[PDB]
Amino acid sequence: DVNTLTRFVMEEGRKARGTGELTQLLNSLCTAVKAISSAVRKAGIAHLYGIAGKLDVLSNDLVMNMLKSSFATCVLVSEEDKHAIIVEPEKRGKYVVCFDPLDGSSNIDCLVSVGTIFGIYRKKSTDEPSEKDALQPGRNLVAAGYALYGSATMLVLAMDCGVNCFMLDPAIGEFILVDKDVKIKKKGKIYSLNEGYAKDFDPAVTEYIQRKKFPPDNSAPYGARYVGSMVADVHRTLVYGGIFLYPANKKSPNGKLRLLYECNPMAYVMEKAGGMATTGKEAVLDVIPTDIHQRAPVILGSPDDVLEFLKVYEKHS
Amino acid sequence: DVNTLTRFVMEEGRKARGTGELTQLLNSLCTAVKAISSAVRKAGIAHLYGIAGKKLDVLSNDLVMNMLKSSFATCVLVSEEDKHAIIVEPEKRGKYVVCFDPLDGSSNIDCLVSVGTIFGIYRKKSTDEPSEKDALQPGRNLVAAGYALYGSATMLVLAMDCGVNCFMLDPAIGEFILVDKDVKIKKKGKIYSLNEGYAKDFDPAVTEYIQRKKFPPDNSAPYGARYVGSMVADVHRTLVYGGIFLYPANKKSPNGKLRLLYECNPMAYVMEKAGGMATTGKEAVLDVIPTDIHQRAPVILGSPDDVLEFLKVYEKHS
Amino acid sequence: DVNTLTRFVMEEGRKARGTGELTQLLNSLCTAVKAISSAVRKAGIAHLYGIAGKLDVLSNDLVMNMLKSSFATCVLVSEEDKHAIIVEPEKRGKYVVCFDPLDGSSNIDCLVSVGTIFGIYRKKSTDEPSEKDALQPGRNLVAAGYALYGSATMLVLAMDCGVNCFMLDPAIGEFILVDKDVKIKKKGKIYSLNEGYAKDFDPAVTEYIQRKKFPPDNSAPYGARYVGSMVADVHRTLVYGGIFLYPANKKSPNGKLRLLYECNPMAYVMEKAGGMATTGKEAVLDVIPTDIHQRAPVILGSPDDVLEFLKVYEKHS
Amino acid sequence: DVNTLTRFVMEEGRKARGTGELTQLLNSLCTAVKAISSAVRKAGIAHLYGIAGVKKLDVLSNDLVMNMLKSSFATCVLVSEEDKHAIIVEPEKRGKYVVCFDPLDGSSNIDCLVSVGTIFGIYRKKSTDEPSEKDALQPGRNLVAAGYALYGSATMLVLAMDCGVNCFMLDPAIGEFILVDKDVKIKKKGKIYSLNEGYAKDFDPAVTEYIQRKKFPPDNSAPYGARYVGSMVADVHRTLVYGGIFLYPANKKSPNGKLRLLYECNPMAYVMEKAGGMATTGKEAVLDVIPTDIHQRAPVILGSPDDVLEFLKVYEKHS
Ligand SMILES: O=C(NCCCCCCNC(=O)NS(=O)(=O)c1cccc(Cl)c1)NS(=O)(=O)c1cccc(Cl)c1
Numbered sequence A, C: 001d002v003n004t005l006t007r008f009v010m011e012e013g014r015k016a017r018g019t020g021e022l023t024q025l026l027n028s029l030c031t032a033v034k035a036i037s038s039a040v041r042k043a044g045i046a047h048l049y050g051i052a053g054k055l056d057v058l059s060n061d062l063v064m065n066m067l068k069s070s071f072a073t074c075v076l077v078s079e080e081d082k083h084a085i086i087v088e089p090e091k092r093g094k095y096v097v098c099f100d101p102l103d104g105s106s107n108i109d110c111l112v113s114v115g116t117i118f119g120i121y122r123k124k125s126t127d128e129p130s131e132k133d134a135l136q137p138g139r140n141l142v143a144a145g146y147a148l149y150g151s152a153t154m155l156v157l158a159m160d161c162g163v164n165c166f167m168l169d170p171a172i173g174e175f176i177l178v179d180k181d182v183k184i185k186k187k188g189k190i191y192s193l194n195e196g197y198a199k200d201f202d203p204a205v206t207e208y209i210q211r212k213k214f215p216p217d218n219s220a221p222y223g224a225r226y227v228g229s230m231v232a233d234v235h236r237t238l239v240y241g242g243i244f245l246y247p248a249n250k251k252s253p254n255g256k257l258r259l260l261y262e263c264n265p266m267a268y269v270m271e272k273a274g275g276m277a278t279t280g281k282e283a284v285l286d287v288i289p290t291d292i293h294q295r296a297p298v299i300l301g302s303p304d305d306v307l308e309f310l311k312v313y314e315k316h317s
Numbered sequence B: 001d002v003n004t005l006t007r008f009v010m011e012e013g014r015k016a017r018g019t020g021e022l023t024q025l026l027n028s029l030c031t032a033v034k035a036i037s038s039a040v041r042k043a044g045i046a047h048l049y050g051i052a053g054k055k056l057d058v059l060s061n062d063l064v065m066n067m068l069k070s071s072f073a074t075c076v077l078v079s080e081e082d083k084h085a086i087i088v089e090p091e092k093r094g095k096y097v098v099c100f101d102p103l104d105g106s107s108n109i110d111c112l113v114s115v116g117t118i119f120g121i122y123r124k125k126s127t128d129e130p131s132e133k134d135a136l137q138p139g140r141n142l143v144a145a146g147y148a149l150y151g152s153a154t155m156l157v158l159a160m161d162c163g164v165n166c167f168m169l170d171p172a173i174g175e176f177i178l179v180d181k182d183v184k185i186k187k188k189g190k191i192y193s194l195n196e197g198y199a200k201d202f203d204p205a206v207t208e209y210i211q212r213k214k215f216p217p218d219n220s221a222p223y224g225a226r227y228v229g230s231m232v233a234d235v236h237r238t239l240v241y242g243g244i245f246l247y248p249a250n251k252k253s254p255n256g257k258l259r260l261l262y263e264c265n266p267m268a269y270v271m272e273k274a275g276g277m278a279t280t281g282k283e284a285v286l287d288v289i290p291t292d293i294h295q296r297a298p299v300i301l302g303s304p305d306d307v308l309e310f311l312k313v314y315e316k317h318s
Numbered sequence D: 001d002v003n004t005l006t007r008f009v010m011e012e013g014r015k016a017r018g019t020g021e022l023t024q025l026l027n028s029l030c031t032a033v034k035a036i037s038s039a040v041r042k043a044g045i046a047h048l049y050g051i052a053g054v055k056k057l058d059v060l061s062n063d064l065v066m067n068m069l070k071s072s073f074a075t076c077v078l079v080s081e082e083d084k085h086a087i088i089v090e091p092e093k094r095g096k097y098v099v100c101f102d103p104l105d106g107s108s109n110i111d112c113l114v115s116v117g118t119i120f121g122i123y124r125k126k127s128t129d130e131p132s133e134k135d136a137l138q139p140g141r142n143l144v145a146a147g148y149a150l151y152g153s154a155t156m157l158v159l160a161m162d163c164g165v166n167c168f169m170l171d172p173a174i175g176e177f178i179l180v181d182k183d184v185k186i187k188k189k190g191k192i193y194s195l196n197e198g199y200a201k202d203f204d205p206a207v208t209e210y211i212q213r214k215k216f217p218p219d220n221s222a223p224y225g226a227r228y229v230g231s232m233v234a235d236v237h238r239t240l241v242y243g244g245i246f247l248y249p250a251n252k253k254s255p256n257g258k259l260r261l262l263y264e265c266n267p268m269a270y271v272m273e274k275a276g277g278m279a280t281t282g283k284e285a286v287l288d289v290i291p292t293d294i295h296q297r298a299p300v301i302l303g304s305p306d307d308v309l310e311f312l313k314v315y316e317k318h319s
């Protein structure tokens, strides 16, 4: 049977005998993603260039507005907003959403792949909503994922039931379930990080990357890929296996990527897909944040690859 | 004034007082590229998954082949997808030779990586009956070349004698909009792009040059690295931001990995028209004389200062 | 606040504290309509004409398949199928759907507006489902409406809460609520019927048409519009007011339009918008059908206009 | 072999060995029409309704056609339904063609999603004088090309030139007009008649009698069916495909009809005649009226020749 995102979420909600509030949220997000995809593909650009006589801000506006108007959210954290957004009372629901509306867009001039990342939490306390309701560890995630605006548009949705991949059919604006309950390879053959900053690498990073290019044994060296857009790199890691690194070093002891709307949703997708995601010192999903915009180093991907990195990492402890 | 692909090519053609034959070819290519873009974005995929109860690389080849054949402007067609050159049937024969990779990078499209179309256009040089040899011309002879990038958006980069022009596809109306005119690459970039996974097979010149980017001898800032692994995306980034792109030979590919006829030459021609460079290490890509339509070439291309810096390291190693 | 079809139906379902089975039906139907619209607009026509080297059947297949896979239906009545389709037990739900997948398509060669018409009944008994479960009067409808594929694509959905009109935004494949709680004008200035059958008209129809061209009260004559596609004519009637007539003639002594999947849903929509729909002798919605494909004469539209027809009809006994 | 509007126009131009200036015109027009179609289909309407936190379609359509034609470098004088005066193209953009167009005919009723369309007529500038309104005051006989885009269940561009009438279907997936009907000809006789019968009390006596013959045929033939969309492009296009007759005739209250000669009547008459049909005012061929005002009206009766002939015979019967 053909299965859409709308039908999938609705069928999971009836299975779980829920009220439908999470389904209203995910439906709203899905609508926002189709609008971002349409703008990312430059629909209407002819009207900008005079046929009849910013993108990350629009994406933020689409996500913020679809989420607020879903009546399912109370606190919204965006990479684009300095403070947490508090949903007005008449629209308040029980969920906290952290999102990067258009991750990687700083390089969209080269039409590089871009994406939207989101993580959904349940509001934990009965207190008035505030920034603190978004300061939960990734362990508490209800749902997380990303939309990849790549050669095609794909939404990856991770929940307790696993990870599911929905392809956007632009002809009809429907997300078609094309990969059910996806699992990452136990071990990959690709590593992904920016080697241009090699001189600032932690010694453990230097050694682990050196083993990937010059394996001690007779196995094939890994291939290298680094798109520079986290959603693109993580998705390839999910599909092909391997390891993605943005680790800590002395000049950036906390990594560079952000915990709430980059690392945690990707770590959560990875763990639901049978992968791993660590900072080097602990699982990403176990970091308890103190700032909505705090940074986290992240090493994620195939479990065997991530375990091997941690082995090199403790060696240098 | 708004400018489209269809308007731009027609206006260059009237300037040159041509017959319109190259415009008919380029229109056909443009139409095929919009069909490929539409398919690459998975329009109609719901019907594939049973909403009512051909691999993409094969479809893309078919779109280019058929639009080019029926354009009446071509006589010989070389595609990455076909072992032998395609000879256009007599009644449809025109004067141009086209080498193209219909869906470059498609082997990894499962991860939705950017993919692209690359093309190079030659005038058939000899009066012999059309054959594979008509496509064995050095890149210096190119009439026009470029690529379509199916990335976050779909962009056609078209290079001719008049320079490099970038057209953005407006999906809402199926029109290519001129968005960057007479494009020029930076004299020097800050990004280097290659698969460092083959570091154990790198020739000493490549090894030293990469060492200079991460550990600059002059205590300037190291370059950033990017590598999509899809040639059109990496070359286009190099064009837009500057820098250097390397795909040198390795043990698995002693004559390089990339193809001369429908990957290296068109990108080399786009780069040289954009004030960039493209070398194999020993000579300009555009100066290689091909002997086999599918032959491979090592390629280093991008900002002139960076490529010259590589060549100086290359000369240091004899 | 922006509102979609999916958001609207879901929030009405939560208001009613229903199981969600009707929402899955409408979601399925909405997906079918976007697919028909894209096909009606000739998306992909280039591939038919050889770029790389029946429409009424497709529409039926899309509706049949989306309704079956919603798990909400048990009996399906279509203009394209002689007998009712009985949903197989594993996909069986509680709703009975009568639909015209592509009304007006016999003249689609001239690109006339076409549409999809649907009526939704709840199955009443615990007997095994059969054709007779579709033999209910229009009074029993739970929901009804139509999709109009005209200059743009619009879904008009009628339920107990009223009529709501959603415009399809093709850029994102979303139905946007653009007209809430629609009500038809008390009286219009347009009458709509095939005057080519004037030689076969009942005397009351003959007199009523004379009144539109030669008004007894010295008011301005009505204009005439007749697209020949029922969804196009009825929707104009809804938007501008007036009256639409398909009365009996010699080739169609019981009228031509079908009661179950043309007359009843339009009659239900009109009554929910404050209009009327009659056969001349009784309300359309009160006819008890004995055949899934049986015909009905139908006069519908603005109440004052239809009441004026009933006045002329009553004059002729 | 698949054929698009872009290939078809380029192939006819090379045959005719033209400079390509008309091809640039038609290409610009085609681009304007795809933008109109996209807007008419309500692409982006979600942004009007607040999805992220604005001219009528007839104003935008006029803006699209004007700008694409101006910037084609192929036009000098432009006549639009939306402008009282003709537009004189600035010198640096000036070409040799005069275009009369209705940017979105039928749009006053677009609230009900009725079919709408764009109609155009293209002339060569005749005189060596500085371009002015006078250059659009040519009879329909002088048309180089004419046609319409129908935004109906699908979008179709009907392009008529000396070589005949060709129908191109718009494929939205790729924004290409695909040639689907070559060198189309209308039926010799149809079975549909098309006019607003609500104004019957104002009908000319010939119109009353001819419509009476369609509903009550004297010779025991079948009565005609009636269709009236109220949007001219839809009614004419149905007339072209199915045959029959379309009437917007003169009456006592409107001695010149209601439709406009320059950008509505002439192009439909030109399409009809290239398709082997007819179009008359009752008194002469539409294409033979010599206009004196760019916005002047003309009565039009068009469609299958036999149906039009039967109309003219009844019209002549009434002196
Ligand atoms: O629609 C109806 N009711 C609203 C839907 C109720 C819940 C159904 C599904 N549950 C759910 O989604 N739960 S959850 O928490 O979001 C969740 C939980 C876990 C994972 C996920 Cl992914 C989501 N009723 S009705 O009869 O159809 C009706 C009645 C009148 C008018 C209409 Cl128009 C329709």
Ligand SMILES: O=C(NCCCCCCNC(=O)NS(=O)(=O)c1cccc(Cl)c1)NS(=O)(=O)c1cccc(Cl)c1
Residues within 6 Å of the ligand: B009, B010, B012, B013, B014, B016, B017, B018, B019, B020, B021, B022, B023, B024, D008, D009, D010, D012, D013, D014, D016, D017, D018, D019, D020, D021, D022, D023, D024, D026
């Ligand atoms: O169309 C017409 N003629 C055909 C077009 C002539 C070519 C004009 C432009 N030349 C050109 O593009 N040359 S080139 O070699 O391809 C070249 C050269 C250099 C760079 C590039 Cl990019 C391309 N005539 S017409 O009056 O419009 C006409 C007449 C009858 C019916 C119609 Cl429908 C239209």
